[PDB]
């Protein structure tokens, strides 16, 4: 996250921290995720497509820091890694950038909801917020494009949704951004999501309800003028999520 503020897991209890085990036993951060039910974490397929072995991943719930065992945190393995069969990448745009991770403790249990571990509600079909609506993003992603390290402490920011017609303008993304994608940015281009925030939530309060409106997917640079953050529009994927969690 570029700009914004440092936060803790109690303010974002649906936030899942996803890591990968490498050969030799070292563990590194991959992407964010969101708890949608006790056994299921939703993320972006582009985070896993190059390393599709479920046994390699570690998922934490209730974790506030990248290298700290936050009190009350829960560690899990991936029982089922589901990638979207029509996922594809263009030079900029990612298509069908959505993934599901079925989680399991070493005892074979799913998440136990607590003050720091809670689910996030899915959106309803054809009911996304209007352009100009303020929404929040969370992640352990880069603080600056030139950084190679990720922040130790979890961050958050607030951005505004951008219309499809504004996002399709020539100086923005043209025809490369589609109706299955949602644009969101800072009107002053100072805060945004960035590399490492992928797979993480775009949470919008709509009609009084906190909703998983988007999943961090792609963008040209980070916090660049006329280059919004692009998110998977979760409301389009409700039949796919239902079928793969049944
Ligand atoms: N401006 C943004 N909001 C934004 C949002 C998401 C981003 C995501 C990345 C990235 C990445 C990345 C890095 C490594 C690999 C993949 C993707 C996909 C498959 N191969 C590995 C970089 C900049 C990003 C910028």
Swiss-Prot record:
Disulfide bonds join 31-47, 39-110, 135-204, 167-183, 194-222. It comes from Homo sapiens (Human). The active site is at residues 46, 97, 198. Glycans are attached at residue 144. Residues 1-246 form the Peptidase S1 domain. The modification Phosphoserine is found at residue 145. This is Urokinase-type plasminogen activator chain B.
